[model samples]
Target: GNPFEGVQLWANNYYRSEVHTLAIPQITDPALRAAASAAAEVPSFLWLDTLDKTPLMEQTLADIRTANKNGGNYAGQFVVYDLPDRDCAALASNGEYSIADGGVAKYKNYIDTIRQIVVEYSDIRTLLVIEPDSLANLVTNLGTPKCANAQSAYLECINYAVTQLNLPNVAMYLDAGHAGWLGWPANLDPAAQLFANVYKNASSPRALRGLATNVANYNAWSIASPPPYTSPNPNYDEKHYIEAFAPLLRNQGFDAKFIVDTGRNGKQPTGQLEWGHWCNVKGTGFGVRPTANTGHELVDAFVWVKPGGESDGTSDPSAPRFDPHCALPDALQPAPQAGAWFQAYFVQLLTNANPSFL
Candidate 1:
């Protein structure tokens, strides 16, 4: 049940599929191929963020079982996204369910489905980060109608998820946006209160290990002080944010640990048009490997919460889901829709990977 103990995530393999299989073999350059192959071997989070994607959960587990049988003992990390009106503040990854359209019932069913599949594979260690950007959006994006409408459903659905998925074999982490979003003094206490309230209201879910930060965004791994551009917010990086905020949640009677996403933060942004530009940021690379050595006592692990090669959103200006962030000077251009593998971006990640995949 405790994934952080034992050999840690690096010793064991993570579930990989066509995402790695199809992409790795196609690389023509030998050096790049070797690096890409090594990178793919490292564990990364698999997202079950859509109803259609739920079936693949079982397929992934089955593959893990095979790997374990063949002397490749494995543990898997998955993202439990798809909350009602998910990603309310963003246009790139909005979900299918809305509260008015029987979203609550549908969402409950969605969680139930994931729970059942997880139960069937009880032997394999499973770590889940539930609903990225759901609650964080509630913190600052409530000024907009989309978030305002999603407030109640997001709260209810998240509480329901925490309550139902609290199995011994599964560890859950609720998504807390990175330092840039909630590190402001004004936002910290309220974010703590809101997270604590939901956790408490969910009957204090025991399997909920903590919060997941910096999913699919660029932020430094650890910085002691805020850089000038990130000033006033104070938490210029994930480590600072967690140190500042974990105590606040603990004070509220919810002692929480955390997982930080080092997936695309290998190269920190500099002189950006805005600190908030998150969609497929250019010049980014794979950061820390998934492991239990997260220096801070309150942090259980540093993980790849966002799979590296996937595009954040389409860069096409005319596309319906296009967000302005994707078209910015910082974002990589000619990207495909979210979830599609971008070969150029994958190569970029390989070339710039921080410890060098080779």
Candidate 2:
């Protein structure tokens, strides 16, 4: 139970303020109002997912140098998702840079800039949660043209990030997708080989703090034994999910730790089409608060990395058919840009949070 005792702070300026404003009028229930307001107090991951923001990171880091949201010394957690051709299959959130579009060369420059910036701000305590879905997509969609030739480049950059950005106070974690994506034996086993390879590429498993899951998405650390049939596994939760992968990751020579995004999985999935409800799904609620007491030996912490109300992707966006994942009848309409705020979604998350905020 080694809790991360560093700079932890809330990242959403838009949503939390909105929560404070709306809770007074929109929320009638005392418990719900308290929960909704409490949403502002939790720590959320900062996004550094694009090359466009590289130049701004130094100033951003400086801004938080004195932040004490967790009442500790200034420390922060930021997500790294700018891998070239990132989220290849999922277009709504794909990176502007891609390897096939001669973007690998561009990505090299991009990541290098990131490394330089991170090291410059090395005086601060930072947790660099590396690319989400970058590795998972490689394993699940290698046949897809986008991923076909990019595996080598993908691993190369990750290893490069680990080596170059291994700052003194920085803890790095690669994305392993979520429990649903890799919870089952089929996906988890092979992904371990892939994840291990990337870990090895970093030259040492210790080169990484561990892996991160459920970044920018919701997945509970625990799930009911009889979860909805639509889920990948009715019994799978983050605990089971990591347990299944621990040995495989160990076999791949990695015995690192991990964090689970408990932002919007407060309750078990119960809608008719549970699997497809990943977007701003209607019934979601916030789960465990960010903490290291994950009740599992291997897990380092349970974090709310994704801001609950943020839209996953837009239905009106083009090039990716997966936008329909957000267009379901229950999905939030008038979806926002990838990281923008969605008021209604936040309202749902806080209202539905377990432990009642009472």
Candidate 3:
């Protein structure tokens, strides 16, 4: 089989140590090693999570380059999902940056560093995922006084990064949260206007295009429910949500395309409580099993943005650290299991599951 033929193989957990363990062996294998070598002849998409703040940037870049050099399918394609100061610690109660006098100068420096990395490694191609959960969540969750200005600052930093990097192979995609979160015109209008203001393009750019939905967590992972699954109005059907947003994108005079995180939506779990994290739910099977046949054109592709089975925080609420390897509990019993909801979902995507909703 052509490794690059069908589905794109995303290193969703490339930042995770376990992924390196699995990928390194292929680089060492004999028969399969050759296949890996031949496969590298083509350019393939590799999504890198920027959330990992382990400070292993140098090592990670080295490994990615080595993978491409050793005949791995990592050429002219890479995406960085996290941006600098993305955690929002810099934001004040008024939503403006407490430091740097409300301007994004400090943030711009961080983006510059990222741009430097991209430029330094010119041989490897890259796409900036820009910032995840920054835009949509800014309005929904982080409703500070200057939330709009903060969002604008963040977007300006993103635009700066794109301009600084200026790589022909690089494309920057700003996230628009998810279909369920925005609902109708309320959130969508602001998001569209904000994105347009930042990108300076009323019509989406070929590089910018639309925005990514269902990243990190399963916002629209299943046909069963939407995110904040514990809410009285859980978004049960994601297909309808996508369909509803299609016209909104068109009306904005922009061609919108969205990517879904199939990494953890295999057996899409429902929220146990109103704020119950999707990870808290059980019986959510493994793999990226999206609504099998939604037939939504606005959705460009369903990629494993977040590999299934990874821990969002900690299943053990007693010790909630951001451990990626944490195991999830059973739905009924709620005990620590071997794998996580997100991990098993990735395994399913690699094997049995097809992400297409045709």
Candidate 4:
């Protein structure tokens, strides 16, 4: 069954919990508070980016269980991100596990723990975006030694995730980076092949759904006109990316469906002269609400895989995890480290929200 066929991420409790506990109380302005409250009703996926963060799932599932006890049936949406040397191409979000230090084994353990929790909460439907930028780095950033050296481990860990997390209640989407990253002509075939090889290696997990695009990046879901940078790459946006990329996956053997990250593509990104500028880009806004009613056949849903208001990375050069891209002029400055709440950026998102949070 297609998980997105009739379900909405709003059926998940993460965003509602966050908006009530963290967001609503903090917003001093009444109007913004109202918007934040309304935005709260809209769902976003929770990220478990580290091994330690995995335990939060138990608490969240417990909350869902209690909430469901009173006759509410909310599901759980999550990002299972901690692959060894995760986000190998970018320093801003490098994971705690390293391949040289038995990272793959630890990653399997992590996946196992997640499997245990969701299985324990078997009554709840689970949506997972597995390992953001993990495989995509192998496609485009192999030139970076960080990605090159971690190649085998990335494959092993991802296949392990696919194999172990294939529970009946779970729906999984592997992260395929934004259109600018893998939608290029050259990257298409190899990226599809890499994912297909992983799927085949995993014996094709029944819970595996499809590709998720534009996670933590600013890419419009679809555009009536193409940008100038989209000339060489026909995929100017996420919808086009799925259109062009999913067929190749089918040819290789999996009829991959998709979920596009509409979390921050509300406005057409400007000031970043490059298509690949994805570090808390200036002038972005919250995009479409999470819905399965995406106007494409292969596309399953448009989701908020990247929680709005969380900083992508800090602009501080001295910080150890600081990425140069975050310091670029296009990136919003004075931003906190990755995953920290950014109040100012949240305000911007509210003000510029595409569908109007009001």
Q: Write the per-residue lDDT of candidate 1 for residues 61-158, one digit (tens) a residue.
A: 77777777777657767889888777888866557787788999999999999999989988777888999888999889989788998898999899
- Model 2, stretches more than 4 Å misplaced? 1-3, 6-37, 68-71, 205-207, 230-235, 270-277, 317-322
lDDT for each residue of candidate 4 in 230-321, tens digit (9 for 90 to 100): 66778888887888889999998887899888888897754456787788888888999888887778888888888888888888899878
Ranking by TM-score: 4, 1, 2, 3
Q: Candidate 2 residues 1-358, lDDT tens each?
A: 2327533543544445656764446767787677666777677776777777775566666666545433446556677778786776663555777676777777778778877877777666677788887888887887787677777878887887788777676777888887767776788878888888777776773438788887755555765564664355742567777888888898879876888888777866634266535677777788887886667778888887777766676756453534667777767776765666676777777667875565
TM of each candidate vs. truth: 0.93, 0.86, 0.62, 0.94
Candidates, ranked, lDDT: 4, 1, 2, 3
- Cα lDDT tens digits, model 3, 1-358, are 1111232232423334443444325344464344333222222234444323223443455566787677764522344444433445222111223334634675565556666666667666454455665666564655554454456556666676556655654555566656556654456566665555555532234456556666654444445434444244433444555556656666656555555655445544433343223343444433343221325556655555544434343444444333222233432223233223334332332332233221
Most accurate candidate by TM-score: 4
Clashing pairs in 1: none
Model 1: runs farther than 4 Å from truth?
A: 7-22, 69-73, 224-228
TM-score of 3: 0.62
